[PDB]
Structures are given as C-alpha cells and as structure tokens.
C-alpha cells in the first residue's frame, strides 16, 4: 500500500521494496531484497547484490556513502501513472 | 593552438543524430545533457534533437540522460569526465584500459553518478604515439590504431558487453564519440 519498489545497478544489480514507515534512523533497515528477503539500510542495500560483475566491466568512482545518487525506483514504474509521484517520495527519503 | 579543443558527435544506435558539436578552446568545460537549449558554446543539449528512425526504447533511454556529463580539458590537455546524471555512463578509454591492467579496447569503464574521473592523458598519448611509430619505422629499416588513441566514446544509460545484451556501442540507444584535437594535431606531426 505505502511501500514501493526500488533498485540499484552498482557492482551488479538489486531490486527491493522500500517502506518509508521504517526509515526512522540513518541505519534503519527499511528496504528488503526481493531475492533473499533480507532487510537493509539504504547504504547497505547499495552494497547488496546476488549477481557478480562481468570483470570485463571496470567500475570507477563507486562509494556507498553516495547511495543517494545510485538508488532509483523500479523500472516497472516507468512510463506509468506512478513514475512522478514515487520520485518525490524517494527524493524526500534521500533528504534526512 | 587549435580552434576547438574537441568535437562531439551524438548517435542513437548506428545513426548519427544532430550536427557535430565543436567546442571552442576557451570553453575548457563542456556539459552534454538531456535538456533543450540549442545555443552552442559550452553546452551541447540532446533533448531537442529529432530522429526520423527513433524508437520507443531510444525515447525511454533519453529520459535518463538528465544532467548528462561534463568533459573537462585540464591544463596540459588531459581530459576528465564528471557524471552529473543520476545514471551511470560507460566509457571507452585506452588510458582506463591501461590504469586497470586490461588489454587495449578489451574493457568498458562504468563511471558512477557524481564521480569525477580522468579519462585521457595527453603526454602518455603522445609518448605511446611517438614510440610505436618510431619502432615500427626502425623495425622495417596502427594509423587507424594510433588515431583511436585520440578519441573517446561514451554511452549514457547502457553498457555494452560480451557480457551484456549488446555487443558494441552502436547497439546502444544513445552515445557520443569525442575527437580530441590537440592529440590529433600531435599524431599528424608524428605521421609526417
Ligand atoms: Ni551482498
Ligand atoms: Ni548474496
């Protein structure tokens, strides 16, 4: 109802469900890996992937501290009613 | 010396879209983004460009270009990229191939949002240039290859890998090729 899906594409990829209710402290597990069902803080979610990099790709400039630049809404919500709404909520959650 | 310090060609898959953007030597920092001001000068916008053969997929991708990237020419002709966009960008750079210990052209370099990474060194390029030429000459007693030292290519949004659904950069929905002019003048002298 209130939780919405999110994703990141750092050192792999990972899709998750974000519940703004639980995001009560910087380190508060509010996101759950749709694969392993584990609950992660945003910064730790950005480090969590079940795929390993191609090692034909090289990754420059990554830092978990900058998770706010890397975390987006799930592509499911793209070209849909809900695209523009979820981004502001997400942006609001980045401010805190 | 050169009038423009680089020039930039935008493509959607294997079709060039728009005219080639030339960057004056007095604009050491050039922004390439997804917005629409057609001005010229220190900013090359891609939002406004038309393409009769555009697809749904290319349209989709163009939405993520957003603030795009800056390409900065530092001092003695070194080139840095800063990824202002909120999606990562992917780069072909022989320098990055070298820095990471990969064979030339045998890697793609993902640059992450907010990152500020150095993607070309003029002196190294010039050295590699002089040296390969002087040796191949004296062995007897890669023009198309040396050329590629003076050029970067970058894809906004999507990478291309073996390793990826798409194999080459001309299969990506929106990318750019960037010819660095001082490097090209130096190779011209070398070839004479
Ligand atoms: Ni992990
Ligand atoms: Ni795992």
Numbering used by the authors:
A (entry chain B): 259 to 354
B (entry chain A): 319 to 459, 491 to 541
Provide the publication's sentences verbatim.
Furthermore, there are direct modulators of TGF-β signaling and the most studied of these modulators are Ski and SnoN, which although sharing 37% sequence identity, have individual essential roles in embryo development and the differentiation of adult stem cells. SnoN and Ski bind to promoter-bound SMAD transcription factors such as the R-SMAD/Co-SMAD heteromer, which in turn recruits co-repressors such as HDAC, NCoR1 or Sin3A to the promoter site.
Therefore, to rationalize the SnoN complex-stabilization results described above at a molecular-mechanistic level, we crystallized a complex between the SAND domain of SnoN (T238-S356) and the MH2 domain of SMAD4 (I314-Q549). A striking structural feature is the strand complementation observed between SnoN β-strand β5 and the edge strand of the SMAD4 MH2 central β-sheet. These interactions include parallel β-backbone hydrogen bonds between the conserved strand β5 and adjacent loop regions (residue Arg314-Trp318) in SnoN and the edge β-strand (residues 424–430) of SMAD4. The interactions also include binding of SnoN Trp318 in a hydrophobic cleft in SMAD4 lined by Leu414, Ile429, Ile435 and His427. Beyond these common consensus interactions, the closed state contains additional hydrogen bonds between SnoN (residues Lys313, Lys324 and His330) and SMAD4. In contrast, the open conformation of our SnoN-SMAD4 structure can be superposed on the SMAD3-SMAD4 heterotrimer without significant steric hindrance between SMAD3 and SnoN. Thus, based on these structural, evolutionary and biochemical considerations, we suggest that the open SnoN-SMAD4 conformation represents the biologically and functionally more relevant binding mode.
